[model samples]
Target chain A: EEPSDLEELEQFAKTFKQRRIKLGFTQGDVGLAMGKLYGNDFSQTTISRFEALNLSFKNMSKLKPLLEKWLNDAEKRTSIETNIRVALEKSFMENQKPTSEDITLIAEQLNMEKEVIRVWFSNRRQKEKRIN
Target chain B: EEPSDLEELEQFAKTFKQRRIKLGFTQGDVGLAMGKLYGNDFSQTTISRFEALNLSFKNMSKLKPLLEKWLNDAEKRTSIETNIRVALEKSFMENQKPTSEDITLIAEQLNMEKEVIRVWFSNRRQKEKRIN
Candidate 1:
C-alpha cells in the first residue's frame, strides 16, 4: 500500500537511517564523514533529525554529494535497523557496555525521545521472539 | 538583499504564525479554529510547532483557505509584531487580569518563551522612560 503522510515521514526517516547503519558507521562516524565532505560541524543529531525531518536540509548543493555516497554504499542495501546495528557494532567496537551517556548520545543523535526508543526496542524484542 | 535559505525558513515560520495571531487568536484558539476548519483534533502545541517549523504543514491544499482569510483580514496590517499585539488586545479585551493560563496561552500563541516576552515587556518600559 502507498504510505500515508505520517507513514511517508516515518519511511523517509527509516530509509536514511538504514543508509548510515549499513555503512558500519556510528552516529559519530557518519557525522564525521559528512563533516569532512560538507565543511560544517555535522552532528549525529543533524543526520538523525534530517531523517526525521525535524531538521531540514539547508544546502542542497552540499547534500548532493552525501546523497550520492549513501546511494552507492553497501550499508544502504538493507533494512534500516539491521544496517544501523551493523554500523554501530563495527565502528563503535560494540562489545563494550553502552553507558547512560551512550544511550543519551543515540537518543540525541536520532533526535528521538529516549522513551520512544525504549518502546521501539521492546517491540523489536517481541518481533525477534516471534521470528525465533 | 535576496533572502538566504535560513531567512526563507524563518520568514515562512513568521508568516504562518502572524496569521493565526491576527485573528485575535491564541494557540488553543487557532487550534480550535483549525480543527473546526480541518477535521483533525489539533493542539496548541501542534499549532505553535507548525508555525515554528518544529512541525511542518502536511496538507498544502487544506492550508489554502487559511492563507486567503489571513491575507484579506483587516488585521493584516503594518508590522508582524504590531499585528500580534492588536490581536491579543482584541480578544479577551485589552486589559483584564490575566490568569496564569492566559499568560501561558499568549506564550504558546506566539510559540515564544515567556522569557522573550518578559524581556519584551521590560524593554517596552525602558523605551517609555526615554520617551517620557
Candidate 2:
C-alpha cells in the first residue's frame, strides 16, 4: 500500500517550505533562481502558492521536480561571492553577448563552470530586457 | 490627452478577446503559440487571466507587448499546413537536434523561414522534455 501521488506531494510541499527557510531564501529568491536553473520563470506568487498548496493540482505536479532540484542544488552549493559577482557584472557591462572564449575566461577567473557563466549572462540579459 | 496605462490595457484586453475570437484561436492555442514565438511559455490560465484583467498591474503591463506581437503575427501569418507539420514531426522523431543545413533544407521544402523551422524544432524538444 503506497501513498498516493497527492499524499506524497503534500508531504514534500510541507517539508519544502521548512527546508527553504533553513536555507534562508525568500520566495522571490526561489522564483528568480528557478528561472536561471530551469528556464521557467516562476513568479514569487507562484512560489508562495506552491508553499501554501494554493495552485491547481496540475500546476503543483508540474512545479514539484523543479523545486526538488532547486532544493537539492541549494543544499549542496555555496552562494556566489560578492567579488566574483562584481567581476561578472563588469564583464556584462562590456559585452552582454559573450562568446564561448569569453565564457571560458570568466569561468577560469571566477572558478565557476563555463555553463554557469553562460547562463548568468543569459539571465542578466533577460533581466535587462524586462527592466527596459 | 492619452489614456493612462490601466485605461489602455483595459481597452486592449477588451479588444484582444474580440479579435482572438475572430481569428478562431482558443486561449490554449495562443498559449502554445507564444512559446514557439517568444520562448515564453504562458499557460492557458495566464492567457485567460490576461484577457479577463485578472492579473496584477505589473503582470498586465508585462504581458502587453507579447500579446500585441502575437495578435499582429497571427493576423499576418498563415498557420502551418498539416502536411508540413507531419513532415516536421517525422523529422523530430528521427532527430530532435536539427543542423543549420537541415533547417535550411526544411525551410526550402516547407516554404518557411529557416528561423521558423529552427524554433519549431526547439519548441518540439521543449514539449518532449515537459511530457517526459
Candidate 3:
C-alpha cells in the first residue's frame, strides 16, 4: 500500500492534525502520552516534525505504530478531554508561548504531565510561525 | 568503575589500533567486519573518528557495545585465520613465488578473499624488513 511513502505520510498528517484537535489533545499531550504508551516522550517539536513529515524515514516508520495505536485509543473515551478546562484551551490557542509558571499551572489544572505542558507551549509558538 | 568513561575509551582506542595492526587488518577491514557483526556498516571516517574519540558522548555510548563485541569476535576469528596464514607463509618461504592463480586457489581454500592472502604476504614481508 506504500503506507510509509511520502504521499501517505502527508495525507496522514493532514488527518492527524484535524482529528487531534477534534479530540481536544494538543501536540504536547501526544508527546506525553507517548511516554505512557512507549516509555519515550518526544518533545512537542518532535511531534510537530512528525506531523510535518520532516524527519528521517526510519524515525517516521518507528513512530507510525505508536501513532496508529494512539489514534485508535483516542477515538474512544481513552482520549483526554474531560480533564482539561476551556480557559486552558483558549490559553493554548492564544498564547504563542506560555511561561514556566503558566505551564506548571496548566499541567495542574489539566492533570497532564508538566513536560506535556512545556512542549505544548513550544509547539504553540511553532504554530504561530505556520500561521504567519 | 565507569568502563565507558573517557579514560577507558581512550585506552581502548590505543589498544584497538595496536591490535588491528597486529592482526594485519586495516580500518576498512574492521569497518567491513562491523557490517557482518551488526547489520549496519559505518564509513572509514566514522571508524577513524571513533578511534580518535572525536564523536559525541551519545554517539560513543551507542557504539560501545558494537565495537566491544566486534573486537572480541574479530580477535577470535582472526586467531584461526592467522594460524593458516602463518603456515602458508612458511611454506612459501621454502618455494618459488606462486602464480596469481595459485594465490586465488589458496584464498578460496581458506575461505578468504584473494586480497586478504596478498595483504598477509605483503604485511609479513614488511614486518620482516622492520625487524631486520
Q: Is candidate 1 or candidate 2 better by TM-score?
A: 2
Better of 1 and 2 by lDDT: 2
Candidate 3, A1-132: lDDT as tens digits: 111333333445567778899989999998788668744465687567667644333233334434655667788123346435465568877775678887898888778888866765654443332201
Write out the backbone clash pairs for model 1: A21-A83, A22-A75, A24-A87
| DockQ of each model vs. true complex | 0.02, 0.02, 0.01
The alpha-carbon lDDT assigned to residue B2 of candidate 1 equals 11
Q: Write the per-residue lDDT of candidate 2 for residues A56-111, one digit (tens) a residue.
A: 23334335544666777888444678898998999999998889997999899889
Tens-digit per-residue lDDT, B1-132, candidate 2: 111133345556677788899999998898898779855556787677566655433334335545666777888555788999999999999988989998899899889988888889866754442211
Per-residue C-alpha lDDT of model 3 across residues B95-127, encoded as one tens digit per residue: 435668877887788787777777666444433
The CA lDDT at A87 in model 1 is 51
lDDT score for residue A114 of model 2: 79
Q: What are the lDDT scores of the predictions, listed in order? A: 0.41, 0.64, 0.56
Query: What lDDT is reached at residue A21 by model 3?
Result: 92
> Alpha-carbon error at A111 in model 2, in Å?
69
Candidate order by lDDT, decreasing, is 2, 3, 1
**Pairs of colliding residues, candidate 2:** none
Interface RMSD score of each model: 19.7, 16.1, 19.1
**What would the C-alpha RMSD of candidate 2 be, to one decimal place?**
22.8
Which runs of model 3 end up more than 4 angstroms from their true locations? A1-132, B1-3, B76-132
